[PDB]
Design an enzyme around this catalytic site. Sequence first.
Site, PDB file in Angstrom:
ATOM      1  N   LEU A 237       0.817  -1.188   0.000  1.00  0.00           N
ATOM      2  CA  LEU A 237       0.000   0.000   0.000  1.00  0.00           C
ATOM      3  C   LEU A 237       0.869   1.264   0.000  1.00  0.00           C
ATOM      4  CD1 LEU A 237      -2.735  -1.023   2.659  1.00  0.00           C
ATOM      5  CD2 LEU A 237      -2.880  -1.197   0.183  1.00  0.00           C
TER       6      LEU A 237
ATOM      7  N   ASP B 116       9.966   3.919  16.779  1.00  0.00           N
ATOM      8  CA  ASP B 116       8.823   4.805  16.497  1.00  0.00           C
ATOM      9  C   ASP B 116       9.407   6.074  15.893  1.00  0.00           C
ATOM     10  OD1 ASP B 116       6.666   6.599  16.494  1.00  0.00           O
ATOM     11  OD2 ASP B 116       6.330   6.538  18.646  1.00  0.00           O
TER      12      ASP B 116
END
Length: 312
Positions: free
Chosen positions: A153, A220
């Site tokens: 995606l 992160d």
Amino acid sequence: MLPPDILQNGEFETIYFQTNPTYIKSPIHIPKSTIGKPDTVKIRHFFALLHQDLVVLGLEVFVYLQIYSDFVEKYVYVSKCDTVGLEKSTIKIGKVIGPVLQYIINYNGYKIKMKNEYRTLPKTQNLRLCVFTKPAKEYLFPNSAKNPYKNLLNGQSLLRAWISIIDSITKGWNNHKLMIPGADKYATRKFIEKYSDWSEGHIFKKDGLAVQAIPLFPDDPKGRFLELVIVECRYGKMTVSRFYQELAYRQEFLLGDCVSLIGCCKENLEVTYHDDLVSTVTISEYKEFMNLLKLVDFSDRVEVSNFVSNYR
């Protein structure tokens, strides 16, 4: 954890285990000045779906329990999610990821040792779910990107997919926040225009120093900037507002493809502590599994089948 129409009495199989709950230093800086500081307990969760001898998808989630006298601040951090794509896709991936992630969020059978036999947690929990979307070709499964049925995606498509998943498992929660650092208000709003409960922003404390508000999670994009702020000992000057402002200009965001930050919260949930026997492992055993994973060529059915047989 998964419905019968997916597992189909053994057509599909699961890998699922947790680390033994382990005390760690708070991922949010708590001044030693603070009164009634919490203890922080971290649990790692690893999930994979198998079809016969092949891996179909994986999900890694970290749970942080900030344990106060009367309540728990419970952070649920989605670390990694990925697919293999060696076989033509039978199930819709969201139909697996949602329920598994919901199971992990609501899991409350942790066996937590006393801080220097088992600790009893407060019944009141405030949930915080934290996810970032960033369209990498291979988060968990090396070389899966050039598999024939791996559906890769773009960033906007990945974000739409995760908003859909997360909305479906946070019904009734107090807030649902989306931030797309560097995007204008109008562009961000379009992703959530059909989601009445979602709004632009983040879930953390809005004022004061960033390091006292925002958790530093491993691997992160947000955390990497926080790490820099700390290593350069700017922790004492950087505000929450200025942190999110400067985050937008980091290479990972500005050169990235719709890199986004999601957070949802549910306040004052009364929970009952509920034994649920799952496989638990030492951190070393966990890390050993993950290190093996890193060395598998996931374009090679032989190596994937071997990896799976070895885990069994």
